[PDB]
Amino acid sequence: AALQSS
Amino acid sequence: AALQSS
Amino acid sequence: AALQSS
Amino acid sequence: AALQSS
Amino acid sequence: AALQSS
Amino acid sequence: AALQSS
Amino acid sequence: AALQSS
Amino acid sequence: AALQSS
Amino acid sequence: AALQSS
Amino acid sequence: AALQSS
């Protein structure tokens, strides 16, 4: 699982 | 921003 | 923004 | 599962 | 920003 | 920012 | 699991 | 910033 | 598990 | 497990 916030 | 993985 | 995966 | 917010 | 993986 | 992995 | 906030 | 892994 | 905040 | 805050 990959979670990215920018 | 809210990111949730389960 | 709300992202949810289950 | 991949979650991305930008 | 809130990131949660379970 | 809050990052939680379990 | 990969969590990234920027 | 809060990072928690369990 | 990898957690990164910047 | 790898936790990085900058």
Q: Do I1 and J5 touch (CB under 8 A)?
A: no
| Alpha-carbon distance values, D5 to A2, C4, C6, J1, J3 (Å) | 11, 11, 17, 23, 20
CA–CA separation, D6 and C6 (whole Å) = 21
CB F4 within 8 A of CB I2: no
- Return the residue of J nearest to I4 by Cα: J4
Residue J5: its chain H contacts at CB < 8 A?
A: 1, 3
Give chain F's radius of gyration (CA, Å): 6
At how many Å resolution was this determined? 1.1
Helix (H, G, I), strand (E, B) or coil at D1: coil
Chain A positions with Cβ closer than 8 Å to E: 1, 3, 5
